[PDB]
From Swiss-Prot, chains A, B:
Localization per record: Cell membrane; Membrane raft
Species lineage: Eukaryota, Metazoa, Chordata, Craniata, Vertebrata
Protein name listed in UniProt: Transient receptor potential cation channel subfamily M member 8
Transmembrane intervals: 3-39, 77-107
Domain notes: Cooling agents bind within a pocket formed entirely by the S1-S4 helices that opens to the cytoplasm.
Gene: Trpm8
Modification after translation, per record: N-glycosylation is not essential for but facilitates cell surface expression, multimerization, association with lipid rafts and ion channel activity.
């Protein structure tokens, strides 16, 4: 009963590895944005990054951004599309896409059970 | 209409039972870690465990860890991989894997409806 689980788990890990490329592209794309737009200047790029790097990577999955919207008049008008495309459009899209891949990998592995 | 639901629910419970082994392995693996690394010493192992045992089991599904990152210079450099592999790499992986299994069990049961 437990045999296929580790193999199916393993294929899932490979899928995560492939999905890491997309995730990294998104992470760079929007972290550099947040750093440039949200605040001006920093202790080099590392300080500005590490200031809020925790939020995009884990908070989005964990909790909704509450102070981010408040922290953000052309700048006022242009701020909203930034965040809107940043989180609700792409991140949700990416996470769901990964989830779909997990569902298909488990499906194909469990379908061919008792031979693997 | 409601007949297959309890059977399909029952198969799902069996799947949960099988997945409990993996979950227990992960729970031991990372609870002992958290206890050893996060803080030094305790009122035996039970005190240190029960101190934060609530978080890994339920909070992760419920809410993102906020104070855990803050609580955590070689120790500073080595702390980040610990948590990173601890929650975002494995727990997410395991929970999704369980979810995939639920989807397949319901699918196969509902596919063969009106005979069960």
């Amino acid at each position: 009963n437990l045999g296929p689980k580790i193999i199916m788990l393993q294929r899932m890990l490979i899928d995560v590895f492939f999905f890491l490329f997309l995730f990294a592209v998104w992470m760079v794309a929007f972290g550099v944005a947040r750093q440039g737009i949200l605040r001006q200047n920093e202790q080099r790029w590392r300080w500005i990054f590490r200031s809020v790097i925790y939020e995009p990577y884990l908070a989005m999955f964990g909790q909704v951004p509450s102070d981010v919207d408040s922290t953000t008049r052309f700048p006022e008008w242009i701020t909203i599309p930034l965040v809107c495309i940043y989180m609700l459009s792409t991140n949700i899209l990416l996470v769901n896409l990964l989830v779909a891949m997990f569902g298909y990998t488990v499906g194909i592995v469990q379908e061919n059970n008792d031979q693997v």
